[PDB]
Design a protein around this nucleic acid. Structure first.
Lengths: 129, 129, 129, 129, 129, 129
RNA sequence: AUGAGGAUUACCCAUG
RNA sequence: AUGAGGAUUACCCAUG
RNA sequence: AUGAGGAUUACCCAU
């Protein structure tokens, strides 16, 4: 294959889409970044290694900028007030076949599918109630 | 409303769908398990806490099992050959708007959409290259 | 440009073709793994480093697995009955030009060419005679 | 029958062809040396031995010389400016059938096939990238 | 894309051009070397790290050799009489826009443009006066 | 000669050009500064000294202002958020002739030439990938 | 609070 | 983190 | 750094 390619991170139906493209590959850690100042960019990083003798583990990180009242290209401090951080860690036993892995991916897609509890809770500054 | 409802975790087109439902909320940790014996069930847990003075942190966990029947002491028991674990932590500043949060959700959905680099790598037991 | 890509390790015409793809490149050690169960995958690693003042040293490593199913307690897992390990080390002085290196490669290819003493001895559970 | 014979180590079509011929086979170590000055000759050695109870272990060794003339005191001698050393060790379990071995050989040939990552990296004084 | 491609380092109008190509990416340090023996090659290395919490730092190195043939122990070896070293560090705030960065690049290009003070002084073995 | 003269640092094709002119010569350290408040100016400094008995060394420093959302003449804090710093250090052995030095300058120009990896990486808030 | 730190996964480890 | 600090250049030195 | 040293193969071992 060669999966390290540009892709659409935020899909707003063609118009207003946020595309993130490869920007670094130091130490096997792939990185995609949107076209912004590094302080306001959407950032995605991913890597895999065999955590133990029994498992392999993907470490996926995502950074999403606060947009409401944002000043494009401006200096916005404190940084912690303007950014959200996602840190995923997927552990998969070495016995998992391609099929097993496809199932795992589907489970992840379903977890975040539109309308389901988790995503709708997050999207509303809410918890479970 | 209420968002603590059941949802289909693994969608196999209506037939063979892994649907998970509410099962516990003790200690502020919402739990969903698939309709199986506790030993072979799929598990999803979620919780939100106001970590910093200015951050809210979601902690989500998903467990995908590889169901199997094991003969222990000459008796067959429903068990799991192994489990795949997804542990994710999402940190959102309190200044995030609902619109700002929807953006985070959309990013996560685009991250795992079919065909995009990351889910592709995972499903093929490979890294990004 | 990039040479850290997917390639054919075993060529069985166009069918049994064993392909190994990049998986990780941490600490100057490149790693390729064939698809499906990590437990039954082929592995190839490589690294170069300045061993002494005048020498650079390559460390190639290959693993050929014997695919098999392991049944225990009635639970079967994809495993490798055993593995064949290849560990080679190539030392090349810094005075070697690209031409000198091409020659070294030809020597390695010739060593293992079909019909020659060494490869044919190995292929037949034999030694030299 | 005999596989301890002369063979082509470097194939330069039908001209620069480096041929190496048997020279000695003492203590289970077969040795091939190219013709002319031992000082500027190519060397190849090989041996097999039962490393452990279930493993047999091959130890192949190759030397590629950089032909040069050494003048000292007005006396010139055929020497090797330097040498490139290849030291490989192949371990094969005793359960390996002739088929398993043929596969192992194909893996070795594939590893060094023209155009693939490793051989092409070596041939260019490069590493992986 | 990919930006890890070869490029002409020293342009002598198509004839005698010193072109350098990718050769290593181990440890997050991209390396390019000219098509020579490792001992006489031109070398270019680059790396980026997020130094401060709000800075990104590029570290670039270039090595220009003075090729020579040295007689060591009565044998001739390709070597470098000496080397000229360029070590540059560029610190860019994370708030820098792509446009802000293009400005940095243009400044560096204008800095070394033919006829301008600095490259003039360097090329004449003198200081600024 | 007398190279300490005003020159164009950022060339935007005649219109919008950034010219930097001599502004200080204390301690043999030449300084050029653009026509701005010292906090928002483009600054260039250069000096040469014999670092050791074998080498001479040029120390070139450049400072480039963040322009996006900049407020001309305003007080912008923190300073580290609004400025980029370039620190070049060129070491040249005392044996280098004028010609040798011209080569070194060309190498530097080629390193930063438009379209080449290093400059295009910087100009895109990127690394090598 | 961090960790391309580990897990048997609502637990354990290291450093602010 | 600095250094018109040094190098044999992906290494070493001094001070925040 | 070598070991026709061992390996659960980027570990372990004498010199």
């Amino acid at each position: 294959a060669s999966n390290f390619t540009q892709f659409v991170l935020v899909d707003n139906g063609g118009t207003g889409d946020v595309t993130v493209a490869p920007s670094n590959f130091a130490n096997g850690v792939a990185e995609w970044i949107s076209s912004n100042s590094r302080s306001q960019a959407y950032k995605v990083t991913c890597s895999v290694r065999q955590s133990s003798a029994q498992n392999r583990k993907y470490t996926i990180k995502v950074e999403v900028p606060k947009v409401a009242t944002q000043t494009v290209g401006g200096v916005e401090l404190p940084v912690a007030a303007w950014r959200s951080y996602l840190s995923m860690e997927l552990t998969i036993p070495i016995f998992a076949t391609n099929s097993d892995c496809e199932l795992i991916v589907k489970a992840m897609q379903g977890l975040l599918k539109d309308g389901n509890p988790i995503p709708s809770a997050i999207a509303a500054n809410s918890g479970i109630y």
